Design a protein around this nucleic acid. Sequence first.
DNA 1: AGTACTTGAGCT
RNA 2: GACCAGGAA
DNA 3: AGCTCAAGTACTTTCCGGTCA
Lengths: 56, 49
Amino acid sequence: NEVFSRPEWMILTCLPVPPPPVRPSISFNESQRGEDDLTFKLADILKANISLETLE
Amino acid sequence: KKLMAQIFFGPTYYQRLRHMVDDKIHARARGPMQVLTRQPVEGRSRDGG
DNA sequence: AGTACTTGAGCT
RNA sequence: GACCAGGAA
DNA sequence: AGCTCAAGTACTTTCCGGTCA
């Protein structure tokens, strides 16, 4: 569909980052974060992206 | 008055089981909500839906 | 828990 | 709160 | 090399103790 889904868009170049309510930090007491699994996976993605970016 | 029937009647070992009702009974109408889903939390203990 | 489809790999 | 494990009409 | 299959896969309920940042 030329408007809503072109094939090129099956490929990712820009990664939408979901906001905290999707990946909320379940924060026991106060001096202890407790971030959500997705927040980590994104962190990884971010990191992995920076290695590649500086590497080239 | 006498019962018209005769009854089977005697000792029989019975056991008190760990399921007691005031440990079971539960009610809720507005109350603690999950964080992720914002739906009611689970379990009598936690005061769930 | 047995059947589903679908994947997979090996043989002639 | 994830996750694992065990036990009930 | 390709092409056939058997043998490979994941997938198909209401209640009420541990370890993990």
